[PDB]
């Protein structure tokens, strides 16, 4: 089911702000690398691994400035999982 990622680090690489803060959280992989139930897989660990390479190249510093807006960017990962569930699923 990483679509609901691609599809959201898609839109997301032009703010760089929530996703940007978010893999930097990548070293924590490791130290929370134990079993939490969901057991989610690397569905996106492969996609993110695009936004990674953008962190060093300049995201790093937009994060800084898009900062700004990273209050209603970080809600947008509650949302992530409805865009495609939802897509594929027209009801509600």
Do not use: C, V, W
């Amino acid at each position: 089911m990483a679509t609901t990622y691609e599809e959201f680090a898609a839109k997301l690489d032009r703010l760089d702000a929530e996703f940007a803060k978010k893999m930097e959280e990548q070293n924590k992989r490791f130290f929370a690398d134990k079993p939490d139930e969901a057991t989610l897989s690397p569905e996106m660990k492969e996609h993110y691994e695009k936004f990674e390479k953008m962190i060093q190249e300049h995201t790093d510093k937009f994060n800084k400035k898009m900062r700004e807006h990273s209050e209603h960017f970080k809600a947008k990962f509650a949302e992530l999982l409805e865009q495609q569930k939802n897509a594929q699923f027209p009801g509600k």
